Design a binder for this molecule. Structure first.
Ligand SMILES: C[C@H]1CCC[C@@H](CO)N1S(C)(=O)=O
Ligand SMILES: C[C@H]1CCC[C@@H](CO)N1S(C)(=O)=O
Ligand SMILES: [Zn+2]
Ligand SMILES: [Zn+2]
Length: 581
């Protein structure tokens, strides 16, 4: 408690000494409350006019139009302490998993140099505004790094002064850039060195690419065993226990020297004890604390969510296979059985999974897994939208499994080669492309963001009739040489290279599931879904609105060209059969 957080609390007390008050009508039950102080401020979703003008039929589709308009009673819940048998299973599994992940990887500190280059090309490193305007500025100024230095030496001393969370089924905890640097220095290696690559972690998919996920799920389907299970956790971040945080910290057991001490301090002072400032309208700032739940940088959050999910799913597999009988208590010989399972089959069982943070797909040895629920519930990883003790329903076909907000189709090219392609409901794809985040967008910047969506569609969703047409229209409407952009960033579509050349590189040349490397010479060689399958996944093909849009598309392209002005444009529409005369 207060010896670790008091210094952070004391320091904030004194910057708002005129405003401090121990409120008695505070709404916190599971958060420790400390005090309040005076503030007054709020970023809503803006429409991308380039994308909207080139997707007119969707202007009357509520599932698209409602996306652009407009639980914190889950952050304020409390998870129970797991039983001694559960805690044992987790500690044994966590110990074994960090050793496996560390066999081919060396923990190391990330550097000011590395941090600086990241900020100078717009990674979403959740920071705040004050003393300097942006992160881009603070980074070039040696004063900043003296602040960083002071805190750093405090962490080596085992104390914290300025690493405070700022709160904003989502919940994002920004810190000042200095705190983010110290987190990145100590734990950035997990992401920077790809500890959760599939080659390294066997279950992980970090860096693998949306064009690889479908092939990865099909490889899992090839294993002998039961149904494919894809259970979502209700509010994963809120169900991370102090025992989970202690198993995650064991990565420090693989470190040495300074790094070991800097990493241990991030875990102890910022993760296992948190200080948070929240805007309450009744508008004051609340300074609250708690020990458990996830509150870290988004990138460290991803890697530790992946780790703890891999751990939880191996234990659920152990329960299904009868490796232990009860979570109340492991016998001494059950401990040796669990250790022996891990050494004997652990790597095989990891390869039966695809795990992206809180999201998983598991193909267990058989369907006993479906009703193996005691360890999963006792760890606090309670399933979404199913009664606690009701057996999981699995998927019989890998093409129907949900993963990372997609499903995957098997699509045979006219030449017999096999593409496994990502897909989701087309209203969701069009609706997201019609939204921008933030202020002060020029027409040119808005156009370059539309071009980024269009090139993503050409590379990932070419098999959807409406998106290949709309992608060609947007790339025709935006000046040929203007560079695609984004404000929070594998994204092979972020290039001025010709999209057919990029398509060949991603789907043929670099695709390890494609034996025949014969390049495709035109977009007409590249297939679509069946027309009925395209409609099932939200296509407007067959509607009068869609027919008029497709037939008159050059009139829409010319409307956008007239707004942007007299620039160099390319006509990409004759890349499609129906516009090729
Ligand atoms: C362990 C080191 C060695 C150098 C390349 C690579 C191979 O796995 N890695 S790295 C940079 O990913 O940490
Ligand atoms: C595998 C891809 C596709 C989308 C999910 C996400 C999580 O793993 N990734 S990635 C390359 O951005 O790391
Ligand atoms: Zn600190
Ligand atoms: Zn689909």
């Amino acid at each position: 408690n207060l010896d670790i957080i008091g210094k952070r609390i004391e320091k904030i007390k004194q910057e708002h000494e005129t405003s401090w008050h121990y409120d008695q009508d505070h709404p916190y039950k599971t958060w420790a409350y400390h005090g309040s102080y005076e503030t007054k401020q709020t970023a809503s979703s803006m429409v991308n006019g380039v994308v909207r003008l080139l997707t007119k039929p969707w202007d009357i589709i509520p599932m698209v139009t409602q996306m652009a308009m407009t639980f914190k009673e889950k952050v304020d819940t409390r998870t129970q302490e797991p039983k001694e048998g559960t805690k044992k299973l987790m500690k044994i599994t966590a110990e074994w998993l960090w050793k496996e992940l560390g066999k081919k990887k060396t923990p190391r500190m990330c550097t000011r140099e590395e941090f600086t280059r990241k900020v100078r090309s717009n990674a979403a490193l959740g920071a705040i505004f004050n003393k300097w305007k942006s992160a881009r500025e603070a980074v070039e100024d040696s004063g900043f790094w003296e602040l960083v230095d002071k805190e750093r030496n405090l962490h080596l001393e085992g104390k914290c002064e300025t690493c405070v969370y700022n709160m904003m089924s989502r919940a994002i905890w920004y810190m000042w850039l200095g705190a983010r640097f110290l987190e990145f220095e100590a734990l950035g290696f997990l992401n920077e060195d790809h500890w959760f690559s599939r080659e390294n972690s066997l279950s992980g998919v970090e860096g693998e690419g949306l064009h690889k996920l479908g092939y990865i799920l099909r490889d899992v389907s090839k294993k002998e065993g039961g149904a494919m299970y894809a259970d979502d956790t209700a509010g994963w971040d809120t169900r991370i226990t102090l025992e989970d945080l202690k198993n995650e910290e064991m990565v420090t057991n693989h470190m040495e020297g300074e790094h070991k001490k800097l990493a241990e301090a991030i875990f102890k002072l910022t993760y296992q004890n948190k200080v948070v400032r929240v805007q309450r309208p009744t508008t004051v700032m609340d300074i609250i604390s708690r020990r458990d739940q996830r509150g870290s940088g988004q990138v460290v959050t991803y890697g530790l969510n992946t780790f703890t999910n891999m751990e939880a799913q191996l234990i659920r597999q152990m329960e299904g296979e009868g490796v232990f009988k009860s979570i109340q208590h492991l016998t001494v010989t059950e401990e040796i059985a669990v250790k022996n399972w891990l050494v004997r089959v652990g790597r095989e069982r990891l390869s039966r999974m695809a795990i992206s943070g809180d999201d998983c797909v598991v193909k267990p040895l058989d369907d006993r897994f479906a009703s193996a629920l005691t360890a999963l519930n006792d760890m606090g990883k309670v399933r979404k939208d199913i009664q606690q003790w009701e057996p999981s329903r699995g998927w019989n076909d890998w093409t129907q499994v949900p993963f990372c907000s997609h499903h995957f189709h098997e699509l045979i090219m006219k030449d017999g080669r096999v593409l496994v392609v990502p897909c989701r409901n087309q209203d969701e794809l069009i609706g997201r492309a019609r939204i921008s985040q933030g202020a002060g967008w020029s027409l040119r910047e808005t156009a370059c963001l539309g071009k980024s969506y269009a090139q993503m569609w050409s590379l990932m969703y070419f098999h959807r009739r409406d998106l290949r047409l709309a992608a060609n229209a947007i790339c025709s409407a935006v000046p040929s040489h203007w560079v695609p952009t984004s404000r929070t960033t594998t994204h092979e579509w972020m290039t001025t290279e010709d999209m057919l050349t990029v398509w060949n590189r991603v789907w043929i040349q670099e695709n390890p599931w494609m034996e025949d490397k014969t390049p495709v010479e035109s977009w007409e060689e590249i297939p679509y879904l069946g027309k009925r399958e395209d409609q099932w996944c939200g296509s407007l093909i067959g509607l009068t609105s869609r027919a008029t849009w497709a037939k008159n598309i050059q009139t829409a392209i010319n409307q956008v060209r007239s707004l942007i002005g007299n620039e160099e444009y390319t006509d990409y529409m004759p890349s499609m059969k129906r516009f090729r005369r």
